[PDB]
Amino acid sequence: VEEIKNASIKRKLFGLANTIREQALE
Amino acid sequence: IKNASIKRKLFGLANTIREQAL
Amino acid sequence: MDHLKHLQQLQNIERIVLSGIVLANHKIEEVHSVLEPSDFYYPPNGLFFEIALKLHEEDCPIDENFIRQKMPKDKQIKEEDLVAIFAASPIDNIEAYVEEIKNASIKRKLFGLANTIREQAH
Amino acid sequence: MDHLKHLQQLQNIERIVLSGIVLANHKIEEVHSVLEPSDFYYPPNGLFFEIALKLHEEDCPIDENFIRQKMPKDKQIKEEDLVAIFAASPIDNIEAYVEEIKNASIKRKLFGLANTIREQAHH
């Protein structure tokens, strides 16, 4: 329902993006 | 939400294209 | 490889794919079915691919001579970026390389979008 | 606020801001609308901001690779100062920081003019 999905998704994208950055350094 | 949705959708498409590739 | 070596290797890889197209024009087709100029990490690499596509569409050989002569005008490619592409060593089987350029591209687009999103959220 | 701590804070804030620009190269337009290289406390950070401004005018990515490629090579940024900038944590909303960086720049300019006024008076 509503924009609940547009949080699971964005957060999904932010988690993937963060995963790729963390996997590029340190 | 307006352009962001279209950007996420086209991004999603460039993604599945790599698999449809065959 | 640290992050730096990876970015340096993406740049190198683009040169090698493009060099191969100069030495074997017909590959522009198999490479284009995956890549657009927009997918190139180093912009001048993108403008080079963009000139080559245009040459191929009209059946004119893709070489140093024609790349320069038909080079845009409003937009140019630096002398060293040109030399660095032409001088890269052509390998066989650039399938992997082409795939890494496309992958790297999708990663960047994801990053741009990830930013823009957390940006519109203020 | 200890004076030493403060200074260290200013240096740390400048990196986080520069590190943030590396994460979102577009943020350089906003930051530049309030900051010039000369406004950075630690000179190497200003030099970095400088190369970045140049890289963005050429639409070239601002990353570890190109920052090191576009370095003046007559003048260079010591590796420790680079890893300092690249390792710092990109924050969300570096606004206050940018205005903080600008504010301390103005203070230093205030202090400089104060000294030339004192010096050029004691003939």
Numbering used by the authors:
A (entry chain D): 98 to 123
B (entry chain C): 101 to 122
C (entry chain A): 1 to 122
D (entry chain B): 1 to 123
The paper states:
Replicative helicases bind DnaG primase to synchronize DNA unwinding with RNA primer synthesis during the process of replication.
We determined the structure of NTD of HpDnaB which is highly helical with a compact head (N-globe) and a long helix (H7) at the C-terminal end. The asymmetric unit consists of two complete monomers and two short peptide fragments. Interestingly, the two complete monomers form a dimer which is stabilized by the two short peptides and it eventually appears as a heterotetramer. In a dimer, the two monomers are arranged in a head-to-head manner where the C-terminal helices are extended parallel to each other. The two short peptides form helices, which are arranged in an anti-parallel fashion with the extended C-terminal helices (H7) resulting to the formation of a four helix bundle. The electron density suggested that these peptide sequences are similar to helix 7 and MALDI (Matrix-Assisted Laser Desorption/Ionization) analysis of crystals confirmed that these are degraded peptides of helix 7 from NTD itself. The dimeric interface consists of 29 hydrophobic residues that bury 3410.56 Å2 of solvent accessible surface area. The head-to-head dimer organization as seen in NTD of HpDnaB is different from other homologous structures known so far. However, the NTD of HpDnaB construct has a half of the helix hairpin (Helix 7) which does not allow the formation of four helix bundle as seen in the structure of MtbDnaB. Surprisingly, we observed that the NTD of HpDnaB shows very weak binding to HpDnaG primase compared to NTDL and HpDnaB, suggesting that N-terminal domain needs to be in a proper conformation for interaction with HpDnaG primase.
